[PDB]
Symmetry: D2
Subunit: 120 residues, 4 copies
């Protein structure tokens, strides 16, 4: 299922536990950006997905502050888990940096990350 260790196309590591009632909890390590070591993540997922072959909707957040660095930014990933032989989490994400009100127009990056359980 969702619980396990995942890796995206950047080489980032996503270690997540899926709770019975819809909680996502875990640890993120990014291969890129103003960051080092582990960061706390929390999110939610659909704990009773539809039985028609549809993916499982989910989302999580990392605020990019830990004991080593603070980038003054946070990323949310929104996506779906697709099970089967080669499980995937396909996401699109938003990274917002803290900015002045005048710089808010350029505060948010958008991207997409695909996660698999295969180590780089």
């Amino acid at each position: 299922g969702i619980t396990g260790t995942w890796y995206n196309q950047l080489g980032s590591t996503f270690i997540v536990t899926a709770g019975a009632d819809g909680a996502l909890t875990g640890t993120y390590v990014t291969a890129r950006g103003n960051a080092e070591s582990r960061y706390v993540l929390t999110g939610r997922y659909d704990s009773a997905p539809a039985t028609d072959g549809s993916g499982t909707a989910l989302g999580w957040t990392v605020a990019w502050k830990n004991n080593y660095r603070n980038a003054h930014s946070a990323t949310t990933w929104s996506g779906q888990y697709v099970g089967g032989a080669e499980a995937r989490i396909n996401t699109q994400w938003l990274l917002t940096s803290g900015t002045t009100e005048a710089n808010a127009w350029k505060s948010t990056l958008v991207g997409h990350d695909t996660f698999t359980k295969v180590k780089p």
Copy 2:
């Protein structure tokens, strides 16, 4: 913290009750005015618990999976934004709403938008 903690409404008439923990945790409950949903949903998120003191906003994000004891939309929204404090406190966000889809329909699985939250006294 006490700044983020409280009751917020957005331009749709949705309501967001949140507690900002000392460790960077956001926890609480969301009621949407719109969509395939009713009653309260669990929210969880993170925020920068040591922001820049330079008049920059405080980065944060949270997610809601649209399943509670009453309804399941098979979808989830993440909001990514910043808290701007002061007398007229705001949380300015962009969001992604992803629905569970079949592989054939995954290309149209995700909506994008923007919500502005005003804190309620």
Copy 3:
């Protein structure tokens, strides 16, 4: 058409002069108030030239590459939105700004935002 055609400003103070052609073409010129840019830039786009008469907006989009005779930011913005006609005409958009990057930096190549355009008499 004559509805879309004209001069528009957004909440940044940017200006958008456009002509909507009978064939669905949008053509004109954009001045941004912000970013790595100055003077006028070429815009080109498309719009639904036979929209629903049901009080739905008119879907459209346009792009600007931020290169003119004066400056090159090595970037381009696309706006995707709808025109809402009437006495207080608006074009409501979401946009993506992509900068040319090296492969190592492609993950942070794209900004997202939202602009509201008001038509000027």
Copy 4:
């Protein structure tokens, strides 16, 4: 270069001409959605990209109306062209449908398309 026939991961066909001064002009055929046959596209690209190995920024629009169908919607793709042995156009896109003002909150889909010159 950019001029040529491209295909994305959905099987859509993108036939584009890149003009000397930054114009993109061409024809789009989609493998998915409320659409059939060719649609007109126009866009722009950076006609003097940086000489440091960076991709070429670009964007284009299709309004999903032709002689066969009208979906009352338009898509913009924003991205960069990456040249070399296996050229790519990597994009993220926004699809806005015409809606009432009250339904505007759910009017815009976001996604990502990767284009190559390889026929399906």
